[PDB]
Write a protein that binds this DNA or RNA. Sequence first.
RNA 1: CCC
Length: 482
Amino acid sequence: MSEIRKDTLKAILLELECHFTWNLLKEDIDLFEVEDTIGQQLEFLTTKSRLALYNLLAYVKHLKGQNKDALECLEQAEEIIQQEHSDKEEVRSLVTWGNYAWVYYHMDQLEEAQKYTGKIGNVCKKLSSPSNYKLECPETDCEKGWALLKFGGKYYQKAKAAFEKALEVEPDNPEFNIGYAITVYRLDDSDREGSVKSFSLGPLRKAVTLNPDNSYIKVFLALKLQDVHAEAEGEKYIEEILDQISSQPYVLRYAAKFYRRKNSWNKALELLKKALEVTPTSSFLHHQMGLCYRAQMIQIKKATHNRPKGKDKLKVDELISSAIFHFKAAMERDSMFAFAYTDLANMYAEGGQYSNAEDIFRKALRLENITDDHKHQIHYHYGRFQEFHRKSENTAIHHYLEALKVKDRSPLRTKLTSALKKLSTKRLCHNALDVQSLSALGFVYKLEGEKRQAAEYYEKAQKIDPENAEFLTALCELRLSI
RNA sequence: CCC
Ligand SMILES: [Mg+2]
């Protein structure tokens, strides 16, 4: 192909609606985890669109440099279109064809790619689309919403908008409602400024009504009810679900979360183990197992006033070892699972395995592509490890400051500001010229809206370090604020 | 998927 036809083709490729134009970046996920879990949903979450799953898996295989394997996934998608979408064959094929075009493009099979853009263009014309090479429709909006969700927390607002676009056309579509309600449910937990939210409660009730046979959507309703102090109602739903299904890991794992949150740890462990028989490598399941063992360990520690002896001490050590095992497995199976790192590191710290804790915290601090909320929490946990285990007040202060710089409204805000005030005040009693502590107080007072007091701290810090760029900038901000 |  002449490289002028090439430029034209590249332009068309960008106009398509498919995974390659949805800004799904590989660095935001663990590709092995995503590939593996897509396979596990194909087998074990049988209510989710198989067509969507294969289109997504094809994209993921491409991201792993396996273009030949991506093609095979798209072939399976085509088979499903014959199987499950025969009446609307052409329109249901658009996303698959888009991915074919992009994959063949990447394999330098330009003529083959053009064949696919041609098919797309023909169908869009046939169906009176206002665009040349796309036909926006609710089913595609839904598929896009799920693809966005799979790429993680940075994409949740975009996924919500995609499901909203689908619901604009079909407000009572059962599939669209599930996607939307689950997105709002995750957003209730995402980027919290304070208490957990419950905007998803209404959407979940509707999605459950619209999908009576679906235990997967119902388990989120139960969890949300638990969040809003209707634990009794939530638990009845859990019981009904467990009467209706067995061994479905995507349902059992959330029932296990439910039971754990009311401290029924043995029941949670029973459910998690049943799920592990089906999917023994799931990082989600492993994390949940560790959470159970950790909770049981904490109960013994509290009961024995943090001084367990004899068999209590033996059990505590077994539980710590088991929590480490499972948190380590979770992290190893999902490199982007922020909480797996901090939970593992914190458990290493609890067991006094400080070199191990440091190793994990170091990796966690270097995760560049997780959400700012997760970065914030990593700094908080490392700060606490520094303060209480390493007894390094200056390193603690440093990381508490980093936590607030990344996110200054969170449920950790007041824990962070109070720790900083406490540590900085103590250090200033010993050395009135301690620049880090002066600077820290300036930062916290500025955050609290105490402009004058903040200025005074920064001015003392600047007196000591007159050319400091950070202090000059802080003082300028304080002067120009209205 | 922590809290
Ligand atoms: Mg996952």
